[PDB]
Swiss-Prot record, chains A, B, C, D, E, F:
Protein name: Insulin B chain
UniProt effect for mutating R22Q: In MODY10; reduces binding affinity to INSR; reduces biological activity; reduces folding properties
Lineage: superkingdom: Eukaryota
Covered range of the whole protein: 25 to 51 of 110
From Swiss-Prot, chains G, H, I, J, K, L:
Protein name, per record: Insulin A chain
Tree of life domain: Eukaryota
Disulfide bonds: C6-C11
Residues shown, of full length: 90 to 110 of 110
Organism classification: Eukaryota, Metazoa, Chordata, Craniata, Vertebrata
Amino acid sequence: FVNQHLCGSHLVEALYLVCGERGFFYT
Amino acid sequence: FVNQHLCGSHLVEALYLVCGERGFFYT
Amino acid sequence: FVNQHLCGSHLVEALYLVCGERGFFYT
Amino acid sequence: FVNQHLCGSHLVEALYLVCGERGFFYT
Amino acid sequence: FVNQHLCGSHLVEALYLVCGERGFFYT
Amino acid sequence: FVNQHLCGSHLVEALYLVCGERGFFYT
Amino acid sequence: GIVEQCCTSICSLYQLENYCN
Amino acid sequence: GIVEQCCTSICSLYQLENYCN
Amino acid sequence: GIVEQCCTSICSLYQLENYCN
Amino acid sequence: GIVEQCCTSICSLYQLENYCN
Amino acid sequence: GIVEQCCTSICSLYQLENYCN
Amino acid sequence: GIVEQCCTSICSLYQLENYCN
Ligand SMILES: [Zn+2]
């Protein structure tokens, strides 16, 4: 991952991609 | 909001739409 | 749903989720 | 572009790309 | 300009939709 | 992230998250 | 339209559902 | 139906222009 | 988790609300 | 490149096809 | 939260992974 | 290309970065 800001849907999508099956906590 | 099977990115997007900034847990 | 702006494909995605197989009108 | 049939959310994605804010009916 | 600017992930998604597995150049 | 096969949109989104505006060739 | 209600401003689920078939 | 013209059968992006509002 | 309740089983607005913080 | 053409300014579908491999 | 770290400011892959399960 | 390396085979972080320009 790198440089740009990540907000809204893009931040949750990046989380979904990076964490995968493990899941994540958007907080 | 119709009842249906929500999977992958769509489930993640659905949680963001419903919860928003309250934050949420995905497992 | 939550308190946030829904723009572009994100709004179309919201419609896709909430309306399901019934379909929708993006107008 | 020589894509075969578009189904589900993929068809919706294609509609927004082509139509944009002109709007469209997904039924 | 009923069609809006295509930036970031949205431009990459549009390129994939139009080009397919054959590939594309994001530059 | 998770060491596993990355295909289609998953791969295009991963390259954007990692490369960003640095650009990349999807072939 | 839906973009003025949900994108320019903030809309509720009720408003959004108004555009379902 | 857009599904028959585009999912059941192959359609081009330019063909979708006829489905815009 | 929510994937078992909403993807394998049928999802609903009420279920989604229960996973909000 | 395509970024300046489609993001900075507005582009058309054929301009995108110009960047296909 | 993650919003302050990744949306308000720019975060790294490591920081982003702090929120995985 | 990257498709063959990451989709047909397995590739990690430093493998995707190798494809950034
Ligand atoms: Zn966006």
